[PDB]
């Protein structure tokens, strides 16, 4: 397939590079420097606010020195994916020169980037909201599961969002597969050549992959809105022949990416309304 | 880049205010012999044309007429003086001691330096105590506000602008009414930033939307909340009607900006207050 997958006590100026940025957001802050919002990931308002910030970091990473020094920063935050941690050990002494910089490395797709954005939480002083929402996730599932475990013993689900010409279905290990999976969730039998990728690809012509599933989620942005690969996906002619789709079974979810505990929580509730429509 | 770049007499009566004097004898209620050319801007209507009928003694690009200081037989001289021309006014305090008795002081910046140098003109001009009121009425009035608006000050980013010809100025935390916001602990916006240690920042009108983070935008005016020709023409950019404080009707004069003096200082509080009541 052409698609391969998968320090101050009280700081006031921060700059929030990746994943850093849902984490200030989550405690009210107001970062003086920001890796550059994409849209997809905020509620429109939270998009219209982190547009007026300064932009120090680009969507492939590369960081702005200049800008980050020009920022004033207290204190700079990010996630690294722990693959890159050798290279983000140079670069940490770099912003060091600036300001205390403090990287948490996360490996994966799943649990690991709740986590990695917990510890972030902990150290801007919103540790306490933030282990709240560990607290009730962890409480939720276990409700969940026992609440409808008929449902989730009989239905299987898919998770997917388009690409380019290709559209993919989310493993058991990353963002809403993830959380799916732990709620002992049986999910289609299309995921399964991801093996240790997050997603597995396909063509359109291969949309019947999807034929299994009695409950299919496409991924949306904060408002429900699926990018434009995914309304391609739900456009085509084999889509609509798909048991799930006529039998009314297909429905958005929100933060599937799970980036904070918070957000995973809003997955669960989802998650929840659909058991209860079955 | 921009085109716009970053024996002293016990009660003496007969005084020569060179520049930064001005607002010492104003405030004391002394009539000068002599002044620095009078700047309109800096000076309330009435007072300006009194400053007016007295003799010129230095221009506003400093060059001092000693003939014209000697002329108007002083008893003392004053003024203020940028620390890094200390070395120059060494030469010059000299000549002007053959006339008179000459007191400069020195001062730092565009922050509470300046305030602080006329507070100690004020002192030798023997109008130290209500001076010292003043000093101390700032330093009560910024703790007040400080508390009593505390939430507004912790969710409002304000921004102060000045225009100049064909661009804008952003004040910096450093200078003037900024540094009155600064000291205040009030959160100001982004476009700040770029000036580094300079007083200010300066965009091209098509970089208006730089201040788009700004919920509260003020803009320097004179004594009689006019703004000058530059600012007029700032505040009817089309871009400018796009900003998010002006559709949210929060742009506001600021009078004194430069803050001279700690009366001037607390005239700047009293309209910072008055922004922060209407939240």
């Not at 890796?35 to 007026?52: H, K, W």
């Amino acid at each position: 397939h052409h698609h391969h997958s998968s320090i101050p006590a009280d700081p006031q100026r921060i700059v929030a590079l990746e994943f850093g940025t849902e984490v200030v957001l989550e405690a009210g802050i107001e970062p003086v420097g920001v890796i550059e919002p994409v849209a997809t990931l905020y509620t429109a308002e939270e998009f219209e606010q982190l547009s007026t910030y300064p932009v120090v970091q680009s969507a492939s990473l590369e960081i702005n020195m200049e800008a980050i020094a020009e920022a004033q920063p207290d204190l700079i935050i990010g996630g690294v994916r722990v693959e890159s941690h050798d290279e983000y050990v140079g670069i940490r002494e770099d912003l060091e020169k600036i300001a205390p910089t403090v990287f948490f490395d996360f490996d994966g797709a799943g649990s690991g980037l709740r986590n990695m954005t917990l510890e972030l939480s902990r150290v801007v002083g919103d540790g306490e909201r933030a282990e709240a929402e560990q607290q009730r996730f962890e409480e939720r599932v276990e409700e969940i599961s026992t609440a409808y475990a008929d449902q989730l013993a009989d239905t299987t689900f898919a998770l997917v969002f388009g690409v380019d010409g290709e559209f993919a279905v989310v493993n058991t290990n990353a963002w809403g597969g993830e959380i799916l999976h732990t709620l002992g969730a049986k999910q289609s039998k299309a995921q399964q050549p991801a093996g240790e990728n997050f997603a597995a690809f396909y063509s359109y012509e291969e949309i019947d992959e999807l034929s299994d599933a009695d409950v299919i989620f496409y991924e949306t942005d904060a408002q429900e809105n699926p990018d434009p690969f995914t309304e391609a996906l739900l456009e085509q002619k084999l889509w609509q022949s798909l048991p799930a789709v006529e039998a009314g079974q297909v429905h958005p979810l929100r933060y599937s990416a799970a980036r904070t505990y918070a957000q995973a929580n809003i997955v669960l509730d989802q998650i929840e309304e659909v058991l209860k429509g079955l």
